[PDB]
Amino acid sequence: PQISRQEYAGLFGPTTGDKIRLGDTNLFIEIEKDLRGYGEESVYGGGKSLRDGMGANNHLTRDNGVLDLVITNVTIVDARLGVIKADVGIRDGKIAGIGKSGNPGVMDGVTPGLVVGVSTDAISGEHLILTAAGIDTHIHLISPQQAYHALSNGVATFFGGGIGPTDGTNGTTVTPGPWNIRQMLRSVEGLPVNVGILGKGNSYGRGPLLEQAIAGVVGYKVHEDWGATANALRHSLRMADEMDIQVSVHTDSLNECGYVEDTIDAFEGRTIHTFHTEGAGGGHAPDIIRVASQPNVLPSSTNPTLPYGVNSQAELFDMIMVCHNLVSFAESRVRPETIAAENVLHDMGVISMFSSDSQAMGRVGENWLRVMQTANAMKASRGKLPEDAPGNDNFRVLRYVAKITINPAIAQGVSHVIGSVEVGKMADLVLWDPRFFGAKPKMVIKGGMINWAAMGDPNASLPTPQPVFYRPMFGAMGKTMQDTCVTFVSQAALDDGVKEKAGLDRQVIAVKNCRTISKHDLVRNDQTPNIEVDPETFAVKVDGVHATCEPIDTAAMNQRYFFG
Amino acid sequence: PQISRQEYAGLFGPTTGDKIRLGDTNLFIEIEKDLRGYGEESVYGGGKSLRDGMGANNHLTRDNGVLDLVITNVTIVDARLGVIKADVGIRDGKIAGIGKSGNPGVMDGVTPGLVVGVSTDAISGEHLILTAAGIDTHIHLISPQQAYHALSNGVATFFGGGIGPTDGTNGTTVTPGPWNIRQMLRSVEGLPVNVGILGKGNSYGRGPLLEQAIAGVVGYKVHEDWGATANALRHSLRMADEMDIQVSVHTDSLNECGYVEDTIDAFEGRTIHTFHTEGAGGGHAPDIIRVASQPNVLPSSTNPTLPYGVNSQAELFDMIMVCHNLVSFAESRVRPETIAAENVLHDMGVISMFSSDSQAMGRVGENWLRVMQTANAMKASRGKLPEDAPGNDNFRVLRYVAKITINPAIAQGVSHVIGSVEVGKMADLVLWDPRFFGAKPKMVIKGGMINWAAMGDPNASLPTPQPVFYRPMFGAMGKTMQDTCVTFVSQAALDDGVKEKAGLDRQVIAVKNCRTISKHDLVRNDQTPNIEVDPETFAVKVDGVHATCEPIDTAAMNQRYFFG
Amino acid sequence: SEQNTPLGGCILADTPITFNENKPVTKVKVRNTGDRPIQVGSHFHFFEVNRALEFDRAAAYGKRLNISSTTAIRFEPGDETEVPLIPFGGKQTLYGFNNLVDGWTGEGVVPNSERPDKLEAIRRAAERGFKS
Amino acid sequence: MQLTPREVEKLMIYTLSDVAFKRKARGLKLNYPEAVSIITVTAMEGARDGKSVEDVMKEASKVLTKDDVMDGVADLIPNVQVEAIFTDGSRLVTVHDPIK
Amino acid sequence: MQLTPREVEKLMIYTLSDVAFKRKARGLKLNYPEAVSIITVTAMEGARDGKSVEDVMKEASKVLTKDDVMDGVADLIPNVQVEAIFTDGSRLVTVHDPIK
Amino acid sequence: MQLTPREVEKLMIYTLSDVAFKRKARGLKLNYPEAVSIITVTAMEGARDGKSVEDVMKEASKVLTKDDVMDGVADLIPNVQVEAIFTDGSRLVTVHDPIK
Ligand code: NI
Ligand code: NI
Ligand code: NI
Ligand code: NI
């Protein structure tokens, strides 16, 4: 038979050629591909297709590869797969398939591995967007409660450091030494997010670095506050290459031991992650932004400058002046010209990642929000990216998504296990209502279980009655919370028995592929142009073109959606 | 000497012949028996009887059978013991005795096993009612927080299924497959209630059923949503009989593969638990209620139809129409005639259990409330049950109590360990103030420790100062929460080492006696009459007598007591 | 357009969706002979529907309703409706339902004869009470 | 007062609606949370006042207009659901398309 | 503001009594939680106002009558206790038979 | 309403400031928590009202005086900080020496 699109959509959601508005933004995504045929559509319910002997197989044991979970008729927004409509399948807390789910007994075209059976539960994705969960590379471990704010914006992995609210943690992403690291590994067992910890890089010999490596860190953080010296850099990077771990940097803002060019030379063409690349959050003043030209630099921005708004200068000024309990350090630190420039460079694919800088100038619960907010402000100011397709904003959206998903993963050497909706990966997933995209998710799926969700009255006759607020779920409960969460570590540590030694019940996974990567390995954000900054007026030129845009008055996904 | 009743009561509470009003209801209970003599009354306090060498033994070590806890001068409302006044004693998280407590050195008539000593703590039951904790057989594992709402109405055992807020869980009490089961077993370790999990019954061979059995389920749930076929039934029940586990059913509402009579024949005289037996919550329309005539059927109702009120039709209509995102399915699903009938049949002892259907049309924190509300509406409409005694409502009350206590237990094969205040049973107990009976308990005693309680300002100079709200206690803390909580499983699973394999710290107890039971084994609710439903007007006849009552305007234990 | 779409809204293309196009269609006449409503879904094995439905049962062997996935057809008491039927796909292996087949429902290889397991099925329907 | 989890949870509603009612009275156009608050409490208060589910439903579907809300909020609130405590007990109230 | 657990807990009281005072002013007869709220806050506010324990006690034992409450609520509230912060410190206030 | 941890947390502020504003209107001199509440909500409400960070800052630095507070409270409140939701997003507002 023949059915109208409108009727089809109502049953099954949007198909190839259909367009979806991402909130109250002016971004419109379009479905590129529909992997789940027509006429044999898998839906859970009374009188529906995923019933016994019909869409569901009723004779196969689980060891035949029957699924543990299926997400049906869902729109996948992923930086590597693009914008597709598919069934998604989970087995052993891993993504087994993307395609057409059902029962091959009674159905043509069931994707191998997507057999629904006796073992299978179901999620109805018809009117939903599925993303990879975000990854926040710049976490200060000041407060355990950050995790909750994060899960509530669709972030489920933390990279950083600290030891609670010490003055060192308030300023840097460091967990200093074998004792503090051990302690912190043990603590995070109580958190419903994945974690990897960073160590203190400012050391003269190998000894003090190696010690922390074996203790379990995934990285070394080089910070001004503890000394952002050439020495620090050099030894940190040399060790890193030895240990297959990452190095992150917060450069010398004062220009004490050098200018940016000297820092660059301290990198010695070695892979490095550069936090708040613009400089409002720290770095060689006015011109740390020039590191975004280099192939060995994996650049990030912290989220308080994105998007650039009318209140942005006022805020930042006042913030530093309290951050550093303080004026010529101030107005040199806080530059309208470079902030605008950061925005543009993002849109170009020259700054490759978003981050929070949690409770050290940024907002742990706003990375997915701000990303979307930025994409939309930038469409307005610049129009369509050249690579956009005329009818849709896919190219753009997808650039931005890479920023909080696959790119962070790649940077910290965990793209093998997390960061994209792809076969063989850990199911660290987020479900969204389009109406709420970026802002307010439906749920978080954390190791194949729902860990976090928007839930109303537990006494009510439905799950939807008011008050609806974010709450832990069963994946967040008991021994499952550890079972479903990863503690990232060094291979050195893994090999030394960190899991036993530290007594960790978390999944313990070795970071890998941190040192052979470059800017060009980054997804949709692989551009290395010439960047020039004017030491007087702080004006930024990118391949000779002035890089600016005007501040926004009104943000999307903002006062409409939030009481906060 | 001689003392007035009124003076006696004030000291010791009510004795044989004294009558107690259960809230703001018109139900009056009467003490049948007083087991704790006169003149040697055991009370805790300064200058009182349970002092060293007097009422308390001071020379016996614990291995002489001295108690760990004593509840004194308490009124026991239990479906097997009736309405008695006694001392209650706990040892090794078990009920050791019901009788007269004290010191046999200095006292006549101390019940063996009720020696109070150096080991003993005390609870003053003088002005209190003691019940068995309720058991909720129809739990959807949508939200972990349900447990708190439950404990707060005197429920401490959950039977059901799910995997958090998936569409399958939102509709059914299923934890599908061995992976999901394992996960869920592990999760519930974090909950302060007893649990047994249900599996997915809709399978063609033995394989897929056996799987889940060994993985640890206590039952199989047959649901329309996954297929409520004859096939499903048949194979589920055959396996059940093999595994000594239970089968619960939510029948085909659409009459797709059959009518009720065909379902009945699919049961094949085999023991079965029938959820929402009336049909508002699901089932063969209009007439699923006829299953309550059969000796092999152990019938239950979900709690939103009990009691029948003036707003009941409006509510239910609208609820389905959203439950199923929807009118001739609606007005056939929602039948005033059968809802009234459900109410009557309850009062007759023809529907044997109350249940919630938690966040899938019923209210997890209202089972004890609604039970009492129903008893009282029914007294009003019908008067005294024929078996009532003229001065009191004991027969009635006790029928109702069986519904949330012993009957659920029997149905799921756990009456050996829980469901009644009887010697040798797990101390899963609730304490109530008569003034608040059914509604707002004082405390919950969970494995011999207080796990949950109404507690005011922890900073205050007493436990009673405002705000008073329900709070976890020490039994709900640490490693004790697992020690004091049971995870019910299959014998198959137990024997296969589920406890080791799954790594459970809970008490792990095999369900037993599920398959040899019938309706007549049920306590105070053992009636199998002829039930007829009119396919036009939906009118119900029970042994030829029209089964109806009129809706209530005003519920007892309701707006007086609750802000909710 | 884009200027008019609500928050989270969809802009749908025009082209209708065509489903089940290849599949051969059998029309059967269905009367509900019971007193209660019967409703049947898209993927149910029509052969094995509620005993009270009277139709050419032989014709529904290996068949489903040629309607939209997830939808259903309602057969009210004492009414007659014509329904389109289509074969199941995949392996044409049907287990469960009312335990009438518990196997292969395909045609097999011989045009202008019936497989004997089909005739068995059909006979068994008849004496289990499934109205034809 | 022996407050149960259901009782405590409902305090959030009361607090957000008080803020919301103050804002609406200043002429502010309401957002999503705020608007949901006002509809929810309207129902709840009706229940307490002794009305029927039917009657409260009407009442709540009429408290807010398109004008009173920020553009688009309607699209965010197709229905509102709350459990309230009626004379005959706790009951679910669905309020259909409340922002007309 | 460095709010301690005792400080935070007291916000529940303030929220329920605001609701309760609104209801009483509509002529609604109060329930148990609501009534307990009003007596509690009366004390608390007295404390803050600088009164004696003795004086607040009187005040709180007089705020609600039998008429102002739902039949039976009295039986549910024999006494109310709260800790309040008096000029000389935190002190327990018992209010004896407040619904006369 | 899908309330996030940040949204829920802010209800505490609203509840304490309502109490605080009632007290100030009785002529009570405010304490530390109360005073911090009033400054915080002033900012927050400004944000919502559509003002600039600059403008709200002024507003909040002027709501309370030395007279309106208990002796010494000033010394306890050198600055107040809150994150509010401005038209352009969430922003930190520092309010310098608010009790003048
Ligand atoms: Ni930094
Ligand atoms: Ni930082
Ligand atoms: Ni059901
Ligand atoms: Ni159910």
Residue numbers in the entry:
A (entry chain C), B (entry chain F): 2 to 327, 335 to 572
C (entry chain B): 31 to 162
D (entry chain A), E (entry chain D), F (entry chain W): 1 to 100
Q: What does the published report state?
A:
They facilitate nitrogen fixation by metabolizing urea, but in some pathogenic bacteria they serve a dual function and consume ammonia to promote survival in acidic environments. The active site contains two Ni2+ ions which are coordinated by six different amino acids.
The homo-trimer is arranged in a tetramer-of-trimers making the full complex a dodecamer of the hetero-trimer. Furthermore, the high resolution allows for a detailed description of the nickel-metallo-center and the active site. The mobile flap of the cryo-EM structure presented here is modeled in an open position, however the local resolution is lower than in the surrounding areas, indicating flexibility. Finally, we noticed that radiation damage can partially explain the shorter distance observed between the nickel atoms in the active site, possibly by a stronger ferromagnetic interaction after deprotonation of the bridging hydroxide molecule.
